[PDB]
Design an enzyme around this catalytic site. Sequence first.
Site, PDB file in Angstrom:
ATOM      1  N   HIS A 123      66.179 -20.310  24.827  1.00 56.53           N
ATOM      2  CA  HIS A 123      65.246 -21.006  23.949  1.00 56.53           C
ATOM      3  C   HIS A 123      65.054 -22.476  24.267  1.00 56.53           C
ATOM      4  O   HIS A 123      64.051 -23.069  23.885  1.00 56.53           O
ATOM      5  CB  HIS A 123      65.670 -20.825  22.490  1.00 56.53           C
ATOM      6  CG  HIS A 123      65.399 -19.453  21.963  1.00 56.53           C
ATOM      7  ND1 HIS A 123      65.575 -19.106  20.641  1.00 56.53           N
ATOM      8  CD2 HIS A 123      64.958 -18.338  22.587  1.00 56.53           C
ATOM      9  CE1 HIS A 123      65.254 -17.837  20.477  1.00 56.53           C
ATOM     10  NE2 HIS A 123      64.875 -17.349  21.643  1.00 56.53           N
TER      11      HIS A 123
ATOM     12  N   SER B  89      60.584 -18.848  28.062  1.00 58.54           N
ATOM     13  CA  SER B  89      60.584 -17.884  29.158  1.00 58.54           C
ATOM     14  C   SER B  89      59.866 -18.295  30.430  1.00 58.54           C
ATOM     15  O   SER B  89      58.994 -19.153  30.408  1.00 58.54           O
ATOM     16  CB  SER B  89      59.984 -16.553  28.697  1.00 58.54           C
ATOM     17  OG  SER B  89      60.681 -16.005  27.600  1.00 58.54           O
TER      18      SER B  89
ATOM     19  N   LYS C 126      54.405  -5.678  21.169  1.00 61.16           N
ATOM     20  CA  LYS C 126      54.645  -5.185  22.517  1.00 61.16           C
ATOM     21  C   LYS C 126      56.092  -4.725  22.650  1.00 61.16           C
ATOM     22  O   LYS C 126      56.366  -3.747  23.337  1.00 61.16           O
ATOM     23  CB  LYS C 126      54.307  -6.268  23.551  1.00 61.16           C
ATOM     24  CG  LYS C 126      54.021  -5.720  24.942  1.00 61.16           C
ATOM     25  CD  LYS C 126      53.496  -6.807  25.861  1.00 61.16           C
ATOM     26  CE  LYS C 126      53.533  -6.337  27.294  1.00 61.16           C
ATOM     27  NZ  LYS C 126      53.368  -7.458  28.247  1.00 61.16           N
ATOM     28  N   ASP C 127      57.011  -5.409  21.964  1.00 58.63           N
ATOM     29  CA  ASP C 127      58.430  -5.052  22.006  1.00 58.63           C
ATOM     30  C   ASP C 127      58.653  -3.736  21.263  1.00 58.63           C
ATOM     31  O   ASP C 127      59.515  -2.930  21.639  1.00 58.63           O
ATOM     32  CB  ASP C 127      59.301  -6.159  21.383  1.00 58.63           C
ATOM     33  CG  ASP C 127      59.567  -7.318  22.335  1.00 58.63           C
ATOM     34  OD1 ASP C 127      59.005  -7.312  23.455  1.00 58.63           O
ATOM     35  OD2 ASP C 127      60.341  -8.231  21.965  1.00 58.63           O
TER      36      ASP C 127
ATOM     37  N   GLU D 234      80.974   7.162  37.123  1.00 57.85           N
ATOM     38  CA  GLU D 234      79.780   7.319  36.310  1.00 57.85           C
ATOM     39  C   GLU D 234      78.677   6.832  37.242  1.00 57.85           C
ATOM     40  O   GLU D 234      78.924   5.953  38.056  1.00 57.85           O
ATOM     41  CB  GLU D 234      79.864   6.439  35.052  1.00 57.85           C
ATOM     42  CG  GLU D 234      81.070   6.713  34.121  1.00 57.85           C
ATOM     43  CD  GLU D 234      82.361   6.023  34.539  1.00 57.85           C
ATOM     44  OE1 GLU D 234      82.933   6.369  35.593  1.00 57.85           O
ATOM     45  OE2 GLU D 234      82.803   5.125  33.799  1.00 57.85           O
TER      46      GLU D 234
HETATM   47  C1  HEM Z   1      74.132  -7.350  26.646  1.00 55.07           C
HETATM   48  C2  HEM Z   1      73.190  -7.813  27.763  1.00 55.07           C
HETATM   49  C3  HEM Z   1      72.043  -8.653  27.707  1.00 55.07           C
HETATM   50  C4  HEM Z   1      71.165  -8.912  26.663  1.00 55.07           C
HETATM   51  C5  HEM Z   1      71.212  -8.362  25.234  1.00 55.07           C
HETATM   52  C6  HEM Z   1      70.135  -9.826  27.162  1.00 55.07           C
HETATM   53  C7  HEM Z   1      69.037 -10.261  26.468  1.00 55.07           C
HETATM   54  C8  HEM Z   1      68.031 -11.122  26.934  1.00 55.07           C
HETATM   55  C9  HEM Z   1      66.853 -11.416  26.124  1.00 55.07           C
HETATM   56  C10 HEM Z   1      66.680 -10.985  24.661  1.00 55.07           C
HETATM   57  C11 HEM Z   1      66.010 -12.095  26.942  1.00 55.07           C
HETATM   58  C12 HEM Z   1      64.586 -12.471  26.682  1.00 55.07           C
HETATM   59  C13 HEM Z   1      63.572 -11.398  27.050  1.00 55.07           C
HETATM   60  C14 HEM Z   1      63.444 -11.204  28.539  1.00 55.07           C
HETATM   61  O1  HEM Z   1      62.862 -12.081  29.211  1.00 55.07           O
HETATM   62  O2  HEM Z   1      63.922 -10.167  29.039  1.00 55.07           O
HETATM   63  C15 HEM Z   1      66.757 -12.391  28.171  1.00 55.07           C
HETATM   64  C16 HEM Z   1      66.302 -13.186  29.240  1.00 55.07           C
HETATM   65  C17 HEM Z   1      66.994 -13.464  30.416  1.00 55.07           C
HETATM   66  N1  HEM Z   1      68.243 -12.863  30.704  1.00 55.07           N
HETATM   67 FE1  HEM Z   1      69.284 -11.534  29.619  1.00 55.07          FE
HETATM   68  N2  HEM Z   1      70.382 -10.254  28.485  1.00 55.07           N
HETATM   69  C18 HEM Z   1      71.510  -9.491  28.823  1.00 55.07           C
HETATM   70  C19 HEM Z   1      72.019  -9.535  30.081  1.00 55.07           C
HETATM   71  C20 HEM Z   1      71.577 -10.329  31.124  1.00 55.07           C
HETATM   72  C21 HEM Z   1      72.044 -10.225  32.523  1.00 55.07           C
HETATM   73  C22 HEM Z   1      73.114  -9.257  32.945  1.00 55.07           C
HETATM   74  C23 HEM Z   1      71.339 -11.158  33.257  1.00 55.07           C
HETATM   75  C24 HEM Z   1      71.366 -11.401  34.604  1.00 55.07           C
HETATM   76  C25 HEM Z   1      72.667 -11.460  35.405  1.00 55.07           C
HETATM   77  C26 HEM Z   1      70.488 -11.872  32.317  1.00 55.07           C
HETATM   78  C27 HEM Z   1      69.615 -12.901  32.686  1.00 55.07           C
HETATM   79  C28 HEM Z   1      68.549 -13.397  31.961  1.00 55.07           C
HETATM   80  C29 HEM Z   1      67.594 -14.454  32.392  1.00 55.07           C
HETATM   81  C30 HEM Z   1      67.670 -15.270  33.678  1.00 55.07           C
HETATM   82  C31 HEM Z   1      66.637 -14.502  31.417  1.00 55.07           C
HETATM   83  C32 HEM Z   1      65.357 -15.357  31.404  1.00 55.07           C
HETATM   84  C33 HEM Z   1      64.248 -14.384  31.814  1.00 55.07           C
HETATM   85  C34 HEM Z   1      62.903 -15.036  32.045  1.00 55.07           C
HETATM   86  O3  HEM Z   1      62.491 -15.858  31.202  1.00 55.07           O
HETATM   87  O4  HEM Z   1      62.266 -14.714  33.072  1.00 55.07           O
HETATM   88  N3  HEM Z   1      70.503 -11.245  31.084  1.00 55.07           N
HETATM   89  N4  HEM Z   1      67.985 -11.731  28.151  1.00 55.07           N
HETATM   90  C1  LIG Z   2      91.734  -3.641  29.983  1.00 50.78           C
HETATM   91  C2  LIG Z   2      90.458  -3.741  30.733  1.00 50.78           C
HETATM   92  C3  LIG Z   2      90.281  -3.581  32.063  1.00 50.78           C
HETATM   93  C4  LIG Z   2      91.397  -3.269  33.001  1.00 50.78           C
HETATM   94  C5  LIG Z   2      88.932  -3.719  32.605  1.00 50.78           C
HETATM   95  C6  LIG Z   2      88.583  -3.641  33.896  1.00 50.78           C
HETATM   96  C7  LIG Z   2      87.218  -3.736  34.304  1.00 50.78           C
HETATM   97  C8  LIG Z   2      86.851  -3.664  35.581  1.00 50.78           C
HETATM   98  C9  LIG Z   2      85.441  -3.677  36.082  1.00 50.78           C
HETATM   99  O1  LIG Z   2      84.475  -4.064  35.081  1.00 50.78           O
HETATM  100  C10 LIG Z   2      84.242  -5.464  35.017  1.00 50.78           C
HETATM  101  C11 LIG Z   2      85.024  -2.269  36.592  1.00 50.78           C
HETATM  102  C12 LIG Z   2      84.723  -1.298  35.433  1.00 50.78           C
HETATM  103  C13 LIG Z   2      83.792  -2.404  37.524  1.00 50.78           C
HETATM  104  O2  LIG Z   2      84.163  -3.261  38.632  1.00 50.78           O
HETATM  105  C14 LIG Z   2      83.401  -4.463  38.750  1.00 50.78           C
HETATM  106  C15 LIG Z   2      83.284  -1.051  38.066  1.00 50.78           C
HETATM  107  C16 LIG Z   2      81.956  -1.272  38.801  1.00 50.78           C
HETATM  108  C17 LIG Z   2      84.319  -0.356  38.964  1.00 50.78           C
HETATM  109  C18 LIG Z   2      83.754   0.964  39.324  1.00 50.78           C
HETATM  110  C19 LIG Z   2      84.642   2.038  39.839  1.00 50.78           C
HETATM  111  O3  LIG Z   2      84.651   3.032  38.872  1.00 50.78           O
HETATM  112  C20 LIG Z   2      85.371   4.202  39.086  1.00 50.78           C
HETATM  113  C21 LIG Z   2      85.305   5.133  38.022  1.00 50.78           C
HETATM  114  O4  LIG Z   2      84.599   4.903  36.851  1.00 50.78           O
HETATM  115  C22 LIG Z   2      86.001   6.385  38.156  1.00 50.78           C
HETATM  116  O5  LIG Z   2      85.875   7.235  37.062  1.00 50.78           O
HETATM  117  C23 LIG Z   2      86.468   8.540  37.102  1.00 50.78           C
HETATM  118  C24 LIG Z   2      86.746   6.669  39.353  1.00 50.78           C
HETATM  119  C25 LIG Z   2      86.810   5.706  40.417  1.00 50.78           C
HETATM  120  O6  LIG Z   2      87.499   5.881  41.615  1.00 50.78           O
HETATM  121  C26 LIG Z   2      88.207   7.105  41.843  1.00 50.78           C
HETATM  122  C27 LIG Z   2      86.111   4.429  40.299  1.00 50.78           C
HETATM  123  C28 LIG Z   2      86.133   3.368  41.362  1.00 50.78           C
HETATM  124  O7  LIG Z   2      86.740   3.480  42.439  1.00 50.78           O
HETATM  125  C29 LIG Z   2      85.325   2.131  41.043  1.00 50.78           C
HETATM  126  C30 LIG Z   2      85.300   1.054  42.075  1.00 50.78           C
END
Ligand code: HEM
Ligand SMILES: C/C=C(C)/C=C/C=C/[C@H](OC)[C@@H](C)[C@@H](OC)[C@@H](C)CCc1oc2c(O)c(OC)cc(OC)c2c(=O)c1C
Lengths: 73, 365, 85, 42, 99, 89
Positions: free
Chosen positions: B187, B191, B213-214, B257
């Site tokens: 904000h 955007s 639209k949403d 998954e």
């Molecule tokens: C629980 C997950 C998330 C929620 C609820 C969320 C929600 C939002 C919302 C409500 C907007 C505004 C609408 C839109 O432009 O899409 C937004 C914008 C944005 N979000 Fe997220 N977000 C999440 C995860 C992420 C992730 C994982 C990234 C990227 C690594 C991210 C990056 C951004 C950026 C850069 C904007 C600005 C977009 C623009 O104005 O072009 N968001 N997000």
């Molecule tokens: C107490 C909390 C703890 C320890 C949290 C840890 C979180 C770690 C990471 O999240 C941030 C992690 C989920 C994320 O890594 C970035 C995933 C992409 C890793 C994906 C992942 O999945 C597998 C999986 O689901 C399986 O299912 C049956 C079996 C698997 O191999 C046999 C895998 C596996 O080899 C990998 C690399």
Amino acid sequence: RQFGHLTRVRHVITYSLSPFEQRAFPHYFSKGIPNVLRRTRACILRVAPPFVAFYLVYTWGTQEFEKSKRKNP
Amino acid sequence: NNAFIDLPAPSNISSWWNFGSLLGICLILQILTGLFLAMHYTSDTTTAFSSVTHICRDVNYGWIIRYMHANGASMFFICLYMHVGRGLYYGSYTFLETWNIGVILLLTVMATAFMGYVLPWGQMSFWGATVITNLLSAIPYIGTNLVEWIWGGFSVDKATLTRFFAFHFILPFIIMAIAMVHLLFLHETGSNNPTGISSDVDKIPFHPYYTIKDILGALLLILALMLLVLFAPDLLGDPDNYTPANPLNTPPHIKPEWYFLFAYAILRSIPNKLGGVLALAFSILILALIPLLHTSKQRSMMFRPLSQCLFWALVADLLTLTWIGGQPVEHPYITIGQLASVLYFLLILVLMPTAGTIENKLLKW
Amino acid sequence: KNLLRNALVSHLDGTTPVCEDIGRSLLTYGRRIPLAEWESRIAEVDARVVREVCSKYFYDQCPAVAGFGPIEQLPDYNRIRSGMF
Amino acid sequence: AAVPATSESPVSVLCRESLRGQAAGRPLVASVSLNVPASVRY
Amino acid sequence: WLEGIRKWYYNAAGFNKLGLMRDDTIHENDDVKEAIRRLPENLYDDRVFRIKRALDLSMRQQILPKEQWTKYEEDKSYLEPYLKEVIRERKEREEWAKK
Amino acid sequence: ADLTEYLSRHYKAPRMVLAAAGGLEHRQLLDLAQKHFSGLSGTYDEDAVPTLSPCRFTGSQICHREDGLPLAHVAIAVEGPGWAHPDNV
Ligand code: HEM
Ligand SMILES: C/C=C(C)/C=C/C=C/[C@H](OC)[C@@H](C)[C@@H](OC)[C@@H](C)CCc1oc2c(O)c(OC)cc(OC)c2c(=O)c1C
Ligand code: HEM
């Protein structure tokens, strides 16, 4: 960020009609399709190739895998 | 108001901008179905799997709430990946705070979904808990200690399941607070838009334009979710999790998954423990580096042909890695996966920054 | 009503305003409407009549809007239109 | 009063026609009202 | 000829189809914002209208008739003299801050 | 020529009103009318008789943005009834 404080604009006129005075779907198909076709064509060369590559790698690898699991590949 | 109703918005944001609100809805959906499932779920290893079947067979509409939660997690990832892709393509990452919080959000959702999958205590639940927590064992000197501490023992067991229910229960609310912070930073700037050009000269009010639209977008999300829940509830799931956990046997075709397949392919491509874990961590954390790798004089990829081609190559590559993650560790998949893994980092660290510079040159600046 | 009565009578003060009221009225109404008639028309207006006539012309009707100057904050037409109900 | 002033205040000439009548000809008078825009004649 | 791919690139980039000039598409950082602030009235107002016209076309997912596309040979950098000086000024300050 | 054509079609006796207010008598006014406006045309003919058609009202908006001016002017209106309607009171 609030309307009234966004930026400076001068000499621009905007004309609009009430939504009750106009159609919501003007030339939907007559002009929409041509536009979709245009947009589709304009991007295809940028979007499609990588996916075609994926397809080729996908079919090649899968076949190579099966062939390798039998007596006479 | 002014955080919604009269919020200024670009007149031209496209459907790619609908995923933020859709992520909010996925989060609310998971929280609502989650709480209702938690009203009937028990975390003891002797009864976890049983309580889940009890939910699906005897709790009124327990089956629909359960499959909505399971498939809702899949919709959550589809939306997350679309949301991140939009950001990379349009240069939304230049909003640094918003972007980095987003990276934290991605990791937290991943951790959250991981723990939830462990709750039904089926085979995949058990081995996923085993493998993923063991990633920490790559940490020198203390890694193994950290794992046993997380497990509450020398192996995944009761202590593990019980604390995972607690972690999975609270983390989504933390995600909600982090998401509110995500929006507050957004904000401050408002955007970005498909052109990557400031839209201050043409802002429109969020309501009624984007509120309607949403809502249309929300309807389409619900259609996709319900097509899965009512017509193919197991399509995106794994049959092996319908088998109770067996600590003495890891299923021969165990696979993650679908939304974790690309990362799993990357880790599997490296025949070294620490190396694979570092590549896994980096495949996600590299998102934090994107802003520093931006070389283009223009924010969005809309006007950048070469960058667009490399962007779709990256998407096609993630599709390749996803496919490879679903295949056995055999020829020629081992090599295709190694190439795809190398290509992933090469596109992000070298090819895209280079295309950016070339495009600048071609425009004479 | 009291404001209107005062405006009507105070306006018809001097030969010019009265002359104009004569000329324009014959063209518009086809006759000069006397003050006593305006009084009758005014007297009959009450809260009910005001609500009904205002509702008839303002309520949920599309307005015409004109803006000039630093108008970045002039509400969007849809928002203006929803303010009509 | 009921009648709005000729010119409502807040806080062009380019021809000889629009300029005729602009020259003052009598002493100044200032008016203030409860219901009507203020005025200054001459 | 490099120049050959250049005109090709210009048209592939396509901001010309929205009636934009190359400088209308630059990413705005602080140097750029300062340069835009220094623009004379006419260059500033023209920029505003071209951007506004482009945002409007984008919203309708449309483009201008080909005859109205910015022509490669006629696109000129109106922002360059201003941005170059803003950057020079900042560099001078940065040098002084190190001494 | 445009001006005479316009005046020719519009300045007709039946479309005019000689009005007077003040210290005078109607009889003298009328006699002066007969004396000076008698030759005023009471007929363009039948091919001219300029008649007004109703004018459609359109819910719409016109915004002339000019941030260089110090204050904003806004005018908003709905379609009104017309002169002769009782509702005007
Ligand atoms: C629980 C997950 C998330 C929620 C609820 C969320 C929600 C939002 C919302 C409500 C907007 C505004 C609408 C839109 O432009 O899409 C937004 C914008 C944005 N979000 Fe997220 N977000 C999440 C995860 C992420 C992730 C994982 C990234 C990227 C690594 C991210 C990056 C951004 C950026 C850069 C904007 C600005 C977009 C623009 O104005 O072009 N968001 N997000
Ligand atoms: C107490 C909390 C703890 C320890 C949290 C840890 C979180 C770690 C990471 O999240 C941030 C992690 C989920 C994320 O890594 C970035 C995933 C992409 C890793 C994906 C992942 O999945 C597998 C999986 O689901 C399986 O299912 C049956 C079996 C698997 O191999 C046999 C895998 C596996 O080899 C990998 C690399
Ligand atoms: C970011 C939000 C959330 C995500 C991504 C998520 C994801 C998951 C996943 C993937 C599973 C495995 C589903 C299966 O195949 O059975 C699961 C299970 C479960 N989740 Fe969540 N969850 C979320 C929020 C919550 C919340 C807030 C609660 C409860 C307060 C919750 C309660 C449960 C319970 C009790 C189960 C076990 C029963 C079942 O497996 O369906 N979840 N969750």
